[PDB]
């Protein structure tokens, strides 16, 4: 009787029949609705109630049922309504409903209706004022004031100052552009909390102080200011992907004959579907215009097709684009252009200045202490960064948000603040939580993959636990397949600003030693990941060699304890032939050149004399066991 919007996910006869029945039902329901409307319009008796239909005289609105009842009442009154003394009736009607006798009936009626109209208009003005006050308190957006609110913190894998910062309202993902040591730049795409996801290295891009991010349809295009190998700036359109990208046929340009003269970079606003380009001025007309940059607006459709249509043009004076306060950010909203500038030190205070584009004026400018409170930043580096306008598709509430860096030296911080309205900052924080060693209640966190192959796949910092069955695969494990029997508390710790991360793995076992290993990994170049260091971490418990009793040469790991009973010792090959099966033995390992390693073996005899024999095996050779015997004394 109704549609099936829950389609089968296996593509069988059920799915095909659902689709076919769906189209059949749509056709049937539509022709039924058409026939129903036609019946309504032609033959349906009492289709409408008489109260509905409107009878519009001059400047007057009323139904038909009310009007007809009024006509009938008029007739009834004129016929069977008693009458007489009309002059006295009028002269008595001259009085009003408070006790004041007017001079004439028309003047009385006028006064009464004017009183009512004035009272109603006063009520209406009060209502409009109350509504406007409610709106201005609810949808308040006054970046003249409205002290900012922290939003989140960014964790890109790059040791450079961030230079632009956009948020995607359709998927709640951040795109963060830093300028690498060379000319080239890189944009990292990452999670709402800050967890890195992937990156794209725009080779031979500029400083890339801001790109534009557009949704022509269900897909995200990126407009940027990329200069070819001949140092010719170009306004170029492309798509996101993971890895590297150079200027070429992989990234097409929108309008070369218009946007290749000067360094131009755009930002897009989807509310009104516009695009403002911050085009630079050449050194020739530089002093003539007294402005390093000028902004020009264009509609999205005009810039998509072949028409310029500069709607609004403005220049940026040196008062705003000075060296002590250089450009760091641009944003457009409701014809109000926002310019964010800030020096690379907290001595020269930053400034956000908003002003109307249509009139080319200065609406406002404010100082804002973003990042460390009380101007007490991490060291002294308040290098500012741009800002944009997040428009949630659910509520429709715009929200300005700004990026800042407060980190000293190579160590860069990446903090985000916002001047949004009510209901946007809360939502942006509550999308997803920040990272933490434990999830929220003091439990271990989950792996991203079960039975992982490379332990370097786990990039997200925090603690984890590898079950004994999940450890079995573990292509890069400190131990071999034969030694692992139990689980491992495995925790990833932050490395440095490139793609590094520390790892630690501590065995889980109460009835034996909880040995731990430690290392470093590099997520990008998996080959650059260190080896498995080891800490002793003993408790007095003992470890036995498993059925891999082929040779003692496989036990290259450093500083372990391995018991060897008589029965155990009567299997090994490297074990000497004189002490085979005479008593128990404790094995220990000591470091050396790679491949090479020393193995000490100590007898376990209480009454008899003690013995210990040492070997060195590996690259240098097999090694000969040298003995040392003790003198029983008391």
């Amino acid at each position: 009787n109704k549609l099936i919007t829950d389609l089968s996910r296996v593509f069988d006869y059920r799915y095909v029949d659902e689709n076919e029945y769906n189209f059949k039902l749509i056709s049937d329901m539509l022709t039924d609705f058409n026939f129903s409307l036609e019946y309504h319009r032609n033959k349906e008796v009492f289709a409408h109630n008489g109260e509905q239909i409107k009878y519009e005289h001059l400047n007057v609105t009323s139904s038909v049922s009310d009007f007809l009842t009024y006509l009938n009442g008029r007739f009834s009154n004129m016929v069977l309504g008693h009458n007489g003394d009309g002059i006295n009736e009028v002269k008595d009607a001259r009085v009003d409903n408070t006790g004041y006798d007017h001079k004439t009936l028309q003047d009385r009626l006028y006064h009464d209706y004017s009183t009512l109209d004035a009272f109603t208009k006063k009520v209406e003005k009060a209502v409009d004022e109350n509504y406007k006050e409610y709106r201005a308190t609810e949808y308040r957006f006054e970046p003249k004031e409205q002290e900012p609110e922290f939003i989140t913190d960014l964790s890109p894998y790059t040791n450079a100052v961030m230079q632009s910062f956009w948020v995607d309202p359709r998927t709640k993902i951040i795109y963060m552009t830093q300028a690498r040591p060379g000319n080239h730049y890189m944009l990292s795409r990452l999670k709402p909390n800050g967890q890195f996801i992937d990156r794209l290295l725009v080779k031979n891009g500029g400083h890339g102080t801001h790109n534009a991010y557009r949704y022509i349809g269900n897909e995200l295009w990126i407009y940027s200011a990329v200069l070819d190998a001949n140092e010719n700036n170009k306004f170029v359109r492309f798509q996101y992907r993971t890895g590297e990208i150079t200027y070429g046929n992989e990234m097409q340009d929108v309008m070369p004959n218009i946007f290749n003269d000067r360094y131009t970079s755009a930002i897009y606003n989807p509310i009104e579907n516009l695009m403002i380009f911050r085009r630079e001025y050449k050194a020739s007309e530089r002093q003539l215009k007294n402005s390093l940059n000028f902004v020009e607006v264009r509609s999205a459709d005009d810039i998509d097709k072949g028409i310029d249509k500069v709607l609004y043009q403005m220049d940026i004076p040196m008062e705003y684009t000075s060296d002590t306060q250089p450009m760091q950010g641009i944003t457009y909203d409701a014809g109000i252009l926002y310019w964010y500038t800030g020096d690379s030190k907290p001595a020269n205070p930053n400034y956000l200045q908003g002003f109307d584009i249509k009139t080319k004026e200065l609406l406002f400018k404010r100082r804002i202490d973003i990042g460390g409170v009380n101007n007490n930043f991490k060291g002294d580096f308040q290098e500012a960064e741009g800002l944009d306008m997040y428009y949630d598709l659910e509520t429709g509430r715009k929200a300005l948000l700004i990026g800042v860096t407060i980190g000293p030296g190579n160590n860069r911080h990446h903090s985000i603040y916002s001047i949004g309205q009510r209901g946007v900052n809360q939502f942006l924080k509550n999308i997803a939580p920040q990272v933490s060693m434990t999830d929220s209640g003091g439990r271990v966190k989950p792996l991203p993959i079960q039975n992982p192959a490379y332990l370097s796949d786990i990039t997200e910092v925090g603690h984890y636990y590898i079950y004994t069955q999940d450890t079995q695969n573990a292509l890069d494990f400190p131990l071999p397949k034969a030694f692992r029997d139990a689980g491992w508390f495995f925790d990833v710790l932050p490395g440095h600003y490139n793609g590094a991360l520390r790892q630690v793995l501590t065995r889980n076992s109460t009835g034996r030693n909880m040995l731990k290993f430690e290392r470093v990994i590099d997520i990008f170049n998996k080959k650059n990941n260190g080896a498995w260091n080891f800490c002793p971490q003993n408790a007095g418990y003992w470890e036995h060699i498993p059925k891999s009793i082929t040779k003692l040469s496989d036990l290259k790991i450093v500083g372990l304890d391995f018991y060897i009973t008589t029965e155990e010792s009567n299997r090994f090959t490297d074990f000497p032939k004189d002490f085979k099966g005479i008593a128990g033995w404790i094995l220990e390992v000591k470091s050396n050149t790679p491949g090479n390693t020393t193995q000490v073996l100590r007898r376990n005899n209480f009454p008899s004399a003690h013995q210990f024999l040492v070997r060195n095996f590996g690259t240098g050779g097999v090694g000969k066991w040298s003995l040392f015997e003790g003198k029983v004394v008391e």
Partner: protein, 314 residues
């Protein structure tokens, strides 16, 4: 109702050649049993039971404009169909018994006629027939007679027969399922999830000791003649290499030493150690995919497994 035939070197369809068909009827597979009767026991032992042959029948007739042409047309049929050359038959159906649609008798909106004198009910693009299913059949012809009913109408009774294996070989591998590149060749007869990259579509795994496979084919791919073909990058060095599998037998490769990055192409009853110079002495056992979950279990976390195969039906 077209009876498509893909031969070794060409593609043909009858209705393109003026050859309408009445229908297609496909028998099931002749089960040859192998019973043995015990001498004085009320019951007989099953030694075996086995599919043999899927005999197809297709009666097709043809009309022409003149009586002579019959001869030509008939010869074309023989030269076009009767091929000992194992061909791949594909069946076709219609989605509807189409009629002529409403028109207007106002010296306009007249009716069309095909190359053959028939009324074209196929007005729109979406009228003509379809490959009803994404499978084929390895097929050979058997004897026909040609009774000529009146006029230019003559009937024929094609009797096709399966060639190698009595099964509905699915066209296209399982990797075209993996990479959604080729379009067509996937009918809803196969209960296939849309979640490409999800489970029960993927036959390309990485870094796993054990994994899961959904063989969508009702018939079991135990027969070697089927194009079951595996290839594995072994991931970890070893001296021996065992892998187990359910709805099948255990497999070993002992006695030959391998290396991690070396790859094995495991064809049906055949083992390329490194793509050539087959080292197939070790535990001659062939794997068997029955239907649905076919769980495998390796032993040292191969860095890659992937395997294409063909789905077969009964």
């Amino acid at each position: 109702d077209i009876e498509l035939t893909k031969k070794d070197g060409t593609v043909i369809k009858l209705s393109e050649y003026g050859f309408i068909v009445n229908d297609i009827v496909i028998d099931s597979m002749q089960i040859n049993t192998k019973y043995q009767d015990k001498e004085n026991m009320n019951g007989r032992i099953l030694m075996g039971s086995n599919y043999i042959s899927r005999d197809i029948v297709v009666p097709c007739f043809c009309k022409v404009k003149n009586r002579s042409d019959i001869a030509y047309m008939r010869d074309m049929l023989y030269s076009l169909t009767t091929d000992i050359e194992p061909m791949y038959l594909r069946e076709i159906r219609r989605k509807e018994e189409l009629n002529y649609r409403f028109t207007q008798p106002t010296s306009d909106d007249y009716v069309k006629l095909d190359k053959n004198n028939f009324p074209d009910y196929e007005y729109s693009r979406h009228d003509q027939q379809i490959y009803v299913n994404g499978k084929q059949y390895k097929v050979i012809f058997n004897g026909v007679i040609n009774p000529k009913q009146k006029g230019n109408k003559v009937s024929f009774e094609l009797k096709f027969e399966t060639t190698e294996l009595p099964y509905g070989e699915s066209i296209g591998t399982s990797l075209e399922l993996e990479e959604n590149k080729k379009v067509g060749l996937w009918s809803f007869d196969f209960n296939i999830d849309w979640h490409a990259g999800g489970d029960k579509r993927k036959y390309t795994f990485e870094n796993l000791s054990k994994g899961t496979v959904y063989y969508h084919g009702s018939a079991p791919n135990d027969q070697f003649n089927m194009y079951k073909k595996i290839t594995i990058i072994l991931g970890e060095d070893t001296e021996s290499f065992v892998w187990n599998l359910t709805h099948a037998e255990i497999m070993k490769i002992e006695g030959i030493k391998l290396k991690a990055g070396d790859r094995i192409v495991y064809d049906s009853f055949r083992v390329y150690k490194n793509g050539v110079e087959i080292s197939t002495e070790t535990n001659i056992s062939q794997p068997k995919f029955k239907y649905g979950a076919n769980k495998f279990e390796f032993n040292q976390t191969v860095q890659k497994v992937q395997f294409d195969l063909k789905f077969y039906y009964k």
